[PDB]
Design a protein around this ligand. Structure first.
Ligand code: NA
Lengths: 300, 304
């Protein structure tokens, strides 16, 4: 089984490392046929990236003819490209996709998945939401029950800032500490709620079946005007949004502090919550590796 | 696909109802060929149990020749029987097993699963731990990661009582109320001794850690009116590579288990990649039945 690895920043590097740690017998026959970055194409599996040829991901794809594309490349939220068109091409060729790149799915989930379903091609995307903590894949083991609503904390930086504030720290001092720890840079991009909006978009599509794109989400982030508040991401059959809200002591999200993420899935039978880390390159890479193993099991 | 349902108390009845709700196209070809209880064998799928034949689970198995045995019978922790011998004979016949009965797995995990692996037979056992909240099945979507330790609240009855005790309710009334809701018998000794949590942590340690323990290896204690006041107490089950135990402990406010209240259960799984926690109802017949239904759908997908 031959992979094309698209992207070789921290996530791709972590992915290649996990793959070589021989973590499952299901991966014994898996090799990386090539790695492609903005610097070119390496037609070898090596720790260090050195391009053998110039060319983009489509050239790599045509040259290598992989069984699976693993997309760990940078999220382009302008238009999802080249990943969006690449996935459609791969699907039409019966090439499976494993991705940690949120953009194509936040922009065009139904387009991609409708096509995959029609061709019987599998898509792993666990690493797009809550990284290595089963979210997408948690729903895979909740068969036969309709999801009514989902609610979560889906961004660690804003959760960390709000955690400090509930403990009596001012917004200004809490933000500074997030910056000190490297969670926020202009911290504007890190605290605007967009990241959570991209994630809840994907969850909503997959779990509820609400064809939604990022433009449909009503989102906002955190700022000095906030007074225990959490940045809540929510989806149901009617709407998708992200907003700061007061959280009761009755709430299983109450204790979800620091950089931790959490997802509460409410079905006709029960409400369950999972919590874990939601970021980190090893974590995201592990979401992808998990999808790879499930794919080898024929369980996507 | 033909099922033999062993047991028909509240979980078996809920399971039958869930199946008849047509919740997945994966189950369209599934029928119940027979239901067996202490009262005999019903060779029909009926809401109400009326025996057609006298005889036990082995007779039912011989007659029906099911593709899958769904065991929702009561756990016999003395020796695991008849479920333990039934599973070994079923595995030898290439018959898959879905179970909510902890005893055979708490007593003979490695043997049962080794036999199953050698025959290519699948065992769903999600309903044995945390009912319908993915636990066993959560680990199924954590492939290629090494579990370092697990810690959780694994018994609904005792969590319900300890939650009430934390609110000024006497142990005696909390017990009385647990009894009233169908959580403890009129003699509640065996409902509160910590054994159920011990059997669950045994199964989790075997499956997730590869710690080949049986019930006899677990240090466990239960609850009673004598527990410390001024602290919120939870019955904590724990396993790592070295030890497995269950005991009532005072819980700190920053502990993720602090607010796991009522009949809610929770499991904290620490792996080489990450520490995660899952929480959901740990008691309720529909919930346990849904654990088994989830396994049945996963089986049909060939994902056990
Ligand atoms: Na206290």
């Amino acid at each position: 089984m031959k992979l094309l690895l698209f992207g070789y920043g921290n996530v791709g590097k972590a992915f290649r490392k996990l793959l070589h740690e021989k973590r499952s017998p299901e991966l014994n026959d898996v090799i990386i046929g090539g790695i492609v970055t903005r610097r070119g194409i390496m037609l070898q599996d090596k720790e260090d990236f050195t391009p053998d040829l110039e060319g983009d991901v489509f050239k790599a794809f045509e040259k290598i003819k992989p069984d699976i594309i693993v997309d760990v490349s940078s999220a382009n939220y302008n238009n999802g490209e080249p990943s969006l068109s690449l996935y459609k091409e791969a699907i039409k060729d019966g090439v499976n996709i494993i991705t940690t790149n949120k953009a194509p799915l936040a922009l065009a989930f139904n387009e991609i998945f409708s096509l995959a379903r029609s061709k019987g091609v599998k898509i792993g995307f666990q690493g797009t939401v809550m990284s290595g903590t089963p979210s997408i894949n948690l729903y895979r083991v909740l068969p036969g029950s309709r999801v009514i609503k989902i609610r979560g904390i889906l961004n660690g930086t804003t959760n960390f800032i709000l955690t400090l504030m509930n403990k009596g720290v001012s917004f200004e001092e809490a933000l500074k500490e997030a910056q000190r720890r490297g969670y926020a840079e202009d911290p504007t991009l890190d605290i605007n709620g967009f990241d959570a909006a991209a994630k809840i978009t994907i969850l909503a599509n997959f779990m509820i079946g609400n064809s939604v794109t990022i433009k449909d989400v009503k989102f906002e982030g955190i700022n000095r005007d906030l007074p225990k508040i959490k940045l809540i991401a929510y989806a149901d059959e009617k709407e998708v949004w992200v907003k700061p809200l007061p959280i009761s002591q009755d709430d299983p999200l109450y204790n979800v502090d620091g950089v931790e993420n959490a997802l509460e899935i409410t079905t006709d039978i029960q409400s369950i919550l999972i919590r874990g880390p939601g970021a980190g390159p090893v974590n995201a890479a592990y979401g992808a590796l998990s999808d790879l193993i499930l794919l080898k099991r024929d369980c996507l």
